[PDB]
A paper describes a structure:
Ferritins play a crucial role in iron homeostasis and detoxification in organisms from all kingdoms of life. The ferroxidase center (FoC), an intrasubunit di-iron site, catalyzes the oxidation of two Fe2+ ions coupled to the two-electron reduction of either molecular oxygen or peroxide. Mitochondrial ferritins are atypical of those found in higher eukaryotes in that they are homopolymers in which all subunits contain both a ferroxidase center and a presumed but undefined core nucleation site.
Co-crystallization of FtMt with Fe2+ allowed the progress of the iron mineralization reaction to be studied by freezing crystals at defined time points following exposure to O2. Crystals frozen following soaking in O2-containing well solution for 2 min diffracted to a resolution of 1.48 Å. The main chain atoms of the model derived from these data overlaid those of the anaerobic structure above with RMSD of 0.13 Å (157 residues). The positions of the residues acting as ligands to the FoC were unchanged relative to the anaerobic structure. Metal ion occupancy at Fe1 of the FoC was somewhat higher, while that of Fe2 was decreased. Strikingly, peroxide, the product of O2 reduction that is coupled to Fe2+ oxidation at the FoC19,32 was coordinated side on between the two metals (Fe–Fe μ-η2:η2 side-on coordination), Figure 3, in a similar fashion to that previously reported for crystals of FtMt aerobically exposed to ferrous ammonium sulfate for 3–5 min.
Author numbering:
A (entry chain A), B (entry chain A), C (entry chain A), D (entry chain A), E (entry chain A), F (entry chain A), ...: 10 to 177
Write the structure that this text describes.
């Protein structure tokens, strides 16, 4: 009922993108626990973000089932980098990733609106759009502090951010 | 991202209006604790409403920060009256104030819809539009009871409403 | 009784100044939670100061009611700046604000003394004058530490002050 | 030390006035428990006020002892009325009594100031002057509500005030 | 019913005498806390007796109300002395006072008997006559011990009685 | 702000006097624990007074810091006596010391009043002037009892005062 | 018994030196709470050291009493500086002070040994000599860390030491 095939396909594309974001964050988590990086709270922060993105994917899979769509999985592409360079660079990449995921969600909302699917619009507004705004704000805050503190070249900056902001 | 400058400005106008509503309610609270009014539960009721309106303003300020807008504060105008005349008159003025704030919020929602900003639309629907409906209903209930009871001329009406309805 | 009209008017002016100080601190709080400032404990510190200044205003409104004066509210002017530049600059501005509020309170005390109003003199001494001294001392301490640490140009100074002194 | 004989005598006069105020309130308490008045919460309210005035007298007696003065007691005059007429009239008389006690305390403060006795000035400001302001405000509130409600001629007014405001 | 006007008047006289006894004991309490007397347990003992005498007065006022009499208050005369000389002398004066109050109560009982008022007779027997006997016995015990111990001239006597008997 | 250099200097003189009073009481405490005096509760009483005087000094040092004055310490002179002769003599000396400290505080209050420094006036009234009155009263009480009991020549007097009044 | 007059005098000199050390530390404590120093944990650290030195003085006074010597107090000289310059300088001065107190205690031990006073030797070894060693070690540790960190010129050094080492 009232579930357009274009919407089914776009949900499937969004599932893949959430799974990709999970993998990017998993890659970052294990970069920060290398013996030549060793920022354990950066590692834990990105591991938590990876697990949140898996939940984002699962909620969309549940939506497909609830609405009678067919889940169609695709390969989860590897992250663009295996070496994330620094805590600052990884935060900047995460910020760009979250902005790109947000744009995809806003395009999905525009499609649902065009198709007169208020249930899908509300689902996105309730579980996705504000979550993306808060995540982009948080990552922007982190980038700003790391830049101001002198990261990555100032030797104390990433260490102190790891211990204070990401320690909690 | 997807935050229109017209929306930024309208949010700033709404912040000011919420702060104005706070000040109106603060003025009313301290009118009801005058030695020649002395309706302590009217006073407490309006003081609580004043504090709620401050929270309404703060949430919009947080939204501006989250979305990357610039908060631009303006003078908070004094309330139209320093003498609120009676418990009935203050309730009628509060009802008109809340209706005017509601109209401003509905205009802000219409602008956000025109600009294709579902995050802002959802923010208003989630935190503002139903809150305004419930507040207008509550104040309308209070006005009706005070009118029926004979306020302000019937000497027992405002006293009994203060002790029973606004006592809790 | 023994409440001079000059004192009534000066109390009304002081109410407005306390409300203005509240607004200044509210503005500062939301500056520090911008995505390009992101000093969350500076933000919380100034938000708490804003709420304290509202209480200062309310106590003076209660005094007006208790003494039989008429509260006369005025517009609450916007703060002089929307961009507070740095944690150091905001602290320096808060220090100057508190010194100006203190001077106004001392002028109010001098007027109450001239009018032979010991109740008003005692009210100011009990709730205002020592509070102002302690606040000026605290803000002076903060300015000194931020200056010594190298704020705002030394990239670690404001971050470390935020995490250690204003974290608690 | 620094205790002027004029101050000793004025303290003794104030002790007598506090004891007189106690007796007035005791008289009122037992008027309201007459079988042809029967307002038990008016009775309890004035009995509590009577006991507070005894404490006011005792604190001044302690001050005389602490400062090395000699307590000189005088007759406690009977109250002006044995029939207090109504709840409204008794409240109006209590308001006038408290205003007269306040004027006496302000005259005592002026004398202590003239004699350069800051300890006595502070004693009065700490324990007496604000207490008098709050008591005058409270009694003024009660008078206003009783007048508005139609007391003493409106048969429900004093009964309802007794049950609601003075019940607590 | 069965309440004779002579009984009403005699109750009013007894109320005044109980209030007078309260004042005598209050005077004694504050004599013992002078810096040149400084017997703090004598002070506390007489303060407690003062408060008991107020209760004796209030019970008679309640009786007047219960029986439909009219309370008619009179001035409360000051105590005969402001300087009570010694702990022994104050105890001897209290003993004489209680004997005089007892004689007045026995005269009141004789009047109630003559008027055939068993309720008043029982009231006096239940709340007053045995209380007076016990108080006279207690004060006689105290006088005897103070005399035997050498008061007031033996420098340790009043001090030791204060610390042991009146300490508790 | 509003802190006169004469006031700064007078506060520094008062700090020294409080420290001197501490030292006097320390000397007395250790006199009473000599093997040829052996009044352990006199010793504890004066040791407690010594520690209170240190707190009096510290509060004035904090005030100097809070107001932006410069603490200027001076030598703490030794007490006038190393042999305090008796419990009575030590109490009489403490009484004279507290009277002299009180006179200095009243002179400091007069200076603060002349300089229009209500914060300093209130500080002294709140923390010092009543504390001095109560201390002078307490020591006067102790002197009176010791004199009446026959101290120092009556062999039981100081022993019994030590065990009863200063035991607690 | 076995208490040499040279030992009595040397104990009296040591009492004075302990009291002097207390005063030095008190001065330092209130330097660190100036509005232009504002290192609150340096302040608390030195205040605690001041109170420990008072206890050191009191134990020697108790020893004099226990052994039958006569306590002879002398003026407590003011500290050499009122401006302690920096956290590093104050620590260096405290280290030198503790070394000088230690030398005095070792000279006192040598005298007690020469006089064949094993009780005094044991008293010093039990309560003083190891305490001095530990205090000198602790202050040396603090000096070393402050020097290495760049104090006083490196703007973060004293602030970070205050928050981490002296915070606890
Ligand atoms: Cl499912
Ligand atoms: Cl695929
Ligand atoms: Cl790469
Ligand atoms: Cl990089
Ligand atoms: Cl880059
Ligand atoms: Cl770094
Ligand atoms: Cl925010
Ligand atoms: Cl404006
Ligand atoms: Cl108007
Ligand atoms: Cl109206
Ligand atoms: Cl109308
Ligand atoms: Cl009404
Ligand atoms: Cl009702
Ligand atoms: Cl109010
Ligand atoms: Cl205006
Ligand atoms: Cl600006
Ligand atoms: Cl700046
Ligand atoms: Cl600047
Ligand atoms: Cl910085
Ligand atoms: Cl007393
Ligand atoms: Cl008289
Ligand atoms: Cl009358
Ligand atoms: Cl009437
Ligand atoms: Cl009338
Ligand atoms: Cl009525
Ligand atoms: Cl009810
Ligand atoms: Cl009754
Ligand atoms: Cl009379
Ligand atoms: Cl007499
Ligand atoms: Cl006698
Ligand atoms: Cl006699
Ligand atoms: Cl005696
Ligand atoms: Cl301080
Ligand atoms: Cl000196
Ligand atoms: Cl001497
Ligand atoms: Cl002597
Ligand atoms: Cl003498
Ligand atoms: Cl003795
Ligand atoms: Cl000892
Ligand atoms: Cl000397
Ligand atoms: Cl120097
Ligand atoms: Cl230095
Ligand atoms: Cl150096
Ligand atoms: Cl440093
Ligand atoms: Fe999470
Ligand atoms: Fe996601
Ligand atoms: Fe995400
Ligand atoms: Fe609420
Ligand atoms: Fe609102
Ligand atoms: Fe509203
Ligand atoms: Fe009711
Ligand atoms: Fe606070
Ligand atoms: Fe304020
Ligand atoms: Fe302030
Ligand atoms: Fe009360
Ligand atoms: Fe009173
Ligand atoms: Fe009163
Ligand atoms: Fe009793
Ligand atoms: Fe009695
Ligand atoms: Fe009696
Ligand atoms: Fe104490
Ligand atoms: Fe003192
Ligand atoms: Fe003292
Ligand atoms: Fe310790
Ligand atoms: Fe030491
Ligand atoms: Fe030491
Ligand atoms: Mg997929
Ligand atoms: Mg997250
Ligand atoms: Mg590939
Ligand atoms: Mg690739
Ligand atoms: Mg919608
Ligand atoms: Mg919704
Ligand atoms: Mg939501
Ligand atoms: Mg969401
Ligand atoms: Mg997220
Ligand atoms: Mg951050
Ligand atoms: Mg605004
Ligand atoms: Mg509400
Ligand atoms: Mg206008
Ligand atoms: Mg207007
Ligand atoms: Mg909702
Ligand atoms: Mg809502
Ligand atoms: Mg509402
Ligand atoms: Mg209603
Ligand atoms: Mg205003
Ligand atoms: Mg504050
Ligand atoms: Mg303007
Ligand atoms: Mg402006
Ligand atoms: Mg105070
Ligand atoms: Mg204050
Ligand atoms: Mg403050
Ligand atoms: Mg600080
Ligand atoms: Mg009197
Ligand atoms: Mg009361
Ligand atoms: Mg008369
Ligand atoms: Mg009369
Ligand atoms: Mg004053
Ligand atoms: Mg005061
Ligand atoms: Mg007060
Ligand atoms: Mg008061
Ligand atoms: Mg009162
Ligand atoms: Mg009322
Ligand atoms: Mg009477
Ligand atoms: Mg008794
Ligand atoms: Mg007479
Ligand atoms: Mg007489
Ligand atoms: Mg019986
Ligand atoms: Mg009985
Ligand atoms: Mg009795
Ligand atoms: Mg006995
Ligand atoms: Mg000094
Ligand atoms: Mg004391
Ligand atoms: Mg000398
Ligand atoms: Mg000397
Ligand atoms: Mg006080
Ligand atoms: Mg005091
Ligand atoms: Mg004291
Ligand atoms: Mg005593
Ligand atoms: Mg010495
Ligand atoms: Mg130590
Ligand atoms: Mg010198
Ligand atoms: Mg020197
Ligand atoms: Mg050995
Ligand atoms: Mg050993
Ligand atoms: Mg050992
Ligand atoms: Mg040791
Ligand atoms: Mg040590
Ligand atoms: Mg260390």
């Amino acid at each position: 009922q009232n579930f357009h095939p274009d919407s089914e396909a776009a949900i499937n594309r969004q599932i893949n993108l959430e799974l990709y974001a999970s993998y990017v964050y998993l890659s970052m988590a294990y970069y920060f626990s290398r013996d030549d990086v060793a920022l354990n709270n950066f590692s834990r922060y990105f591991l938590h973000q990876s697990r949140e993105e898996t939940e984002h994917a699962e909620k969309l899979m549940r939506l497909q089932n609830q609405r009678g769509g067919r889940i169609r999985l695709q390969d989860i592409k590897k992250p663009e980098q295996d070496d994330w360079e620094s805590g600052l660079h990884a935060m900047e990449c995460a910020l760009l990733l979250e902005k790109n995921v947000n744009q995809s969600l806003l395009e999905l909302h525009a499609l649902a609106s065009d198709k007169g699917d208020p249930h899908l619009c509300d689902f996105l507004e309730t579980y996705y759009l504000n979550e993306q705004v808060k995540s982009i704000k948080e990552l922007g805050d982190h980038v700003h502090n790391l830049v101001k503190m002198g990261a990555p070249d100032a030797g104390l900056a990433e260490y102190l951010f790891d211990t204070h902001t990401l320690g909690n």
